[PDB]
Design an enzyme around this catalytic site. Structure first.
Site, PDB file in Angstrom:
ATOM      1  CG  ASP A  15      -2.128   0.933   1.021  1.00 40.11           C
ATOM      2  OD1 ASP A  15      -2.195   1.662  -0.011  1.00 40.11           O
ATOM      3  OD2 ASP A  15      -3.006   0.931   1.912  1.00 40.11           O
TER       4      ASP A  15
ATOM      5  NE  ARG B 245      -4.227   5.235   0.615  1.00 39.61           N
ATOM      6  CZ  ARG B 245      -4.178   5.067  -0.706  1.00 39.61           C
ATOM      7  NH1 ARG B 245      -4.268   6.097  -1.543  1.00 39.61           N
ATOM      8  NH2 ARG B 245      -4.052   3.848  -1.198  1.00 39.61           N
ATOM      9  CG  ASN B 246      -0.543   4.293   3.862  1.00 38.28           C
ATOM     10  OD1 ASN B 246      -1.041   4.450   4.984  1.00 38.28           O
ATOM     11  ND2 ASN B 246      -1.108   3.518   2.910  1.00 38.28           N
TER      12      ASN B 246
ATOM     13  CG  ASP C  43       0.210  -0.142   6.115  1.00 35.73           C
ATOM     14  OD1 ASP C  43      -0.930   0.144   6.530  1.00 35.73           O
ATOM     15  OD2 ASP C  43       0.376  -0.961   5.180  1.00 35.73           O
TER      16      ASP C  43
HETATM   17  C1  I9W Z   1       1.109   5.886   9.960  1.00 35.16           C
HETATM   18  C2  I9W Z   1       1.646   4.783  10.831  1.00 35.16           C
HETATM   19  N1  I9W Z   1       2.338   3.788  10.235  1.00 35.16           N
HETATM   20  C3  I9W Z   1       2.837   2.734  10.931  1.00 35.16           C
HETATM   21  N2  I9W Z   1       3.541   1.858  10.109  1.00 35.16           N
HETATM   22  C4  I9W Z   1       4.554   1.037  10.346  1.00 35.16           C
HETATM   23  O1  I9W Z   1       5.020   0.864  11.472  1.00 35.16           O
HETATM   24  N3  I9W Z   1       4.995   0.486   9.199  1.00 35.16           N
HETATM   25  C5  I9W Z   1       5.874  -0.501   9.019  1.00 35.16           C
HETATM   26  O2  I9W Z   1       6.368  -1.107   9.956  1.00 35.16           O
HETATM   27  C6  I9W Z   1       6.225  -0.854   7.571  1.00 35.16           C
HETATM   28  C7  I9W Z   1       7.036  -2.142   7.530  1.00 35.16           C
HETATM   29  C8  I9W Z   1       4.952  -1.013   6.737  1.00 35.16           C
HETATM   30  C9  I9W Z   1       7.092   0.246   6.947  1.00 35.16           C
HETATM   31  C10 I9W Z   1       2.679   2.657  12.313  1.00 35.16           C
HETATM   32  C11 I9W Z   1       1.956   3.684  12.957  1.00 35.16           C
HETATM   33  C12 I9W Z   1       1.424   4.759  12.215  1.00 35.16           C
HETATM   34  O3  I9W Z   1       0.733   5.791  12.834  1.00 35.16           O
HETATM   35  C13 I9W Z   1       1.354   7.028  13.003  1.00 35.16           C
HETATM   36  C14 I9W Z   1       2.716   7.126  13.296  1.00 35.16           C
HETATM   37  C15 I9W Z   1       3.303   8.384  13.447  1.00 35.16           C
HETATM   38  N4  I9W Z   1       2.584   9.515  13.314  1.00 35.16           N
HETATM   39  C16 I9W Z   1       1.266   9.470  13.030  1.00 35.16           C
HETATM   40  C17 I9W Z   1       0.509  10.768  12.888  1.00 35.16           C
HETATM   41  C18 I9W Z   1      -0.746  10.948  12.276  1.00 35.16           C
HETATM   42  N5  I9W Z   1      -1.082  12.259  12.347  1.00 35.16           N
HETATM   43  N6  I9W Z   1      -0.017  12.892  13.007  1.00 35.16           N
HETATM   44  C19 I9W Z   1      -0.174  14.360  13.197  1.00 35.16           C
HETATM   45  C20 I9W Z   1       0.944  12.018  13.335  1.00 35.16           C
HETATM   46  C21 I9W Z   1       0.639   8.222  12.869  1.00 35.16           C
END
Ligand code: I9W
Ligand code: CL
Ligand code: CL
Ligand code: CL
Ligand code: CL
Ligand code: NA
Length: 280
Positions: free
Chosen positions: A146, A150-151, A164
């Site tokens: 994905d 947006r991600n 993600d």
């Molecule tokens: C978006 C998001 N992604 C992930 N993904 C993750 O750990 N991914 C991975 O491990 C892979 C392997 C897919 C790369 C985890 C949490 C998350 O949540 C967030 C993180 C920080 N900040 C905001 C946030 C939202 N709004 N604001 C102002 C900050 C929102």
């Protein structure tokens, strides 16, 4: 979600990551979903560092849902750190529901940010950092599936990391997610072979990466502008239609987009190559 493919690959939870949930005061809900949310929080002392860093916490649906949050946490502990990636800091898997703690990205997602508005230095910057992220996932044989604007999140410095939202993303109400059986997939970002032949590789994520490029250099236009998704669409990608060059892409970059959108996976570049062409 993001799976581990077969460099060289060789998954139970490691209790090192464990953190006393007692040291977390939640904040505002940063995003929410069909089985999960994600929230601002503050962590009272993680690592001898002994900081009070601001963080995001993900959390939860029956045991069918439990499984996949742990699997998530598993994967994120196998890969280890990288600067252009949303990093696992900790987790609380005892004495309550599973909480997954990650880094925080103050400026939020790249798509809203690009719409809210910055220079063609900054786009080259954003483009290069995400390339560094995927190159890292690629090297662990981790596919994302994905890869979209947006991600992409913007953290301290307006620096890009791939994450993600996954559980914490309202897929059901997002029209960028078309129906297909039980699942709902971001069809406009998918390589053809994934739509039609359900096959998914690093080279598949490259297709998506080219779309991200089209986003970035349109300042957040929805791809295939005005083109609906139905009989005609799938044919156009089978035919091999490609989005035109966006307004702010130097021609060089459009060639990168076209590389990525090669039909035979094996003729698309790699993130390393993309990373290296952006060095120049
Ligand atoms: C978006 C998001 N992604 C992930 N993904 C993750 O750990 N991914 C991975 O491990 C892979 C392997 C897919 C790369 C985890 C949490 C998350 O949540 C967030 C993180 C920080 N900040 C905001 C946030 C939202 N709004 N604001 C102002 C900050 C929102
Ligand atoms: Cl317990
Ligand atoms: Cl960087
Ligand atoms: Cl949209
Ligand atoms: Cl030009
Ligand atoms: Na949907």
């Amino acid at each position: 979600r993001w799976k581990i493919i077969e460099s060289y690959t060789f998954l139970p939870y490691n209790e090192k990551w464990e953190f006393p949930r007692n040291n977390l005061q939640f904040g505002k809900t940063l995003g929410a979903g069909a089985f999960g949310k994600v929230v601002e929080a503050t962590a009272f002392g993680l690592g001898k560092e002994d900081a009070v860093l601001k963080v995001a916490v993900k959390m939860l649906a029956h045991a069918d849902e439990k499984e996949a949050l742990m699997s998530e946490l598993k994967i994120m502990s196998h890969l280890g750190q990288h600067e252009n990636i949303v990093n696992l800091l900790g987790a609380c898997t005892h004495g309550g529901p599973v909480l997954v703690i990650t880094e925080y990205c103050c400026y939020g997602d790249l798509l809203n940010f690009l719409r809210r508005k910055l220079s063609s230095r900054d786009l080259l910057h954003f483009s290069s950092q995400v390339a560094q992220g995927m190159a890292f996932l690629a090297s662990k044989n981790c596919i994302h599936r994905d890869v979209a604007a947006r991600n992409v999140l913007l953290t301290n410095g307006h620096v890009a990391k791939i994450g993600d939202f996954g559980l914490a993303r309202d897929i059901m109400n997002d029209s960028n997610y078309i129906v297909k059986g039980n699942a709902r997939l971001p069809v406009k970002w998918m390589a053809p072979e994934s739509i039609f032949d359900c096959v998914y590789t690093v080279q598949s994520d490259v297709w998506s990466y080219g779309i991200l490029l089209w986003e970035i250099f349109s300042l957040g236009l929805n791809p295939y502008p005005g083109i609906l998704v139905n009989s005609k669409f799938y044919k156009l990608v089978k035919d091999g239609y490609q989005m035109a060059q966006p307004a702010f892409a130097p021609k060089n970059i459009y060639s990168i987009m076209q590389a990525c959108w090669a039909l035979e996976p094996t003729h698309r570049p790699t993130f390393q190559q993309i990373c290296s062409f952006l060095q120049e």
